[PDB]
Amino acid sequence: REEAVVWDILDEVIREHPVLLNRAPTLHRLGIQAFEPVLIEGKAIQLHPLVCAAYNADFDGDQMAVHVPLTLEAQLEARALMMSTNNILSPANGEPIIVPS
Amino acid sequence: ARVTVQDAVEKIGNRFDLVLVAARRARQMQVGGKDPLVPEENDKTTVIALREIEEGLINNQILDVRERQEQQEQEAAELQAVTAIAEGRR
């Protein structure tokens, strides 16, 4: 029914629950990064412009899956190892990967 | 409440252990619920576990003596309650 109560329960299930955006031809390990969702209205997965040069994503129709780390040890591996604010140095070489593009 | 674990990994200089200690301490506050040592600010159990690790009141050593002290004091609750079958049968 989409009752107006669930729209306030759904926002507490998403308090600190990182999700896993990942683009299609995943070349290197920076092609999968977790994020902390924020509920918008629409049908397009917004995405911070700095990170869009790690996925190699133009914004002209490219899509992106979004998984969900389920268990309790699996939303810490998405917050310690995989979070998007840990990868500011590409593993292939010490040069940055969050250069303002 | 926690965006980076860069500070809660200096108590434990290893990422693959921080996700093991805090993955286990963050269960006691969910099943068989013990109490979060830090004052929570309307957060999950995960990020509350990663907020104790930074302040030293949890690590892979404290997290056993904190409990094995209890595993036998429940056996102190074994024998001392074992008197309940000691005085109930005679």
């Binding site: 040890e73 591996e77 190892l81 | 693959f16 252990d17 996700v19 093991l20």
Partner: peptide, 19 residues
């Protein structure tokens, strides 16, 4: 056996041929 799972493999090989 490499990553977060490398820990628990430290214990599996520490049982067989032992206690």
């Amino acid at each position: 056996p490499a990553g977060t799972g490398y820990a628990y493999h430290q214990d599996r090989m520490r049982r067989r041929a032992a206690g």
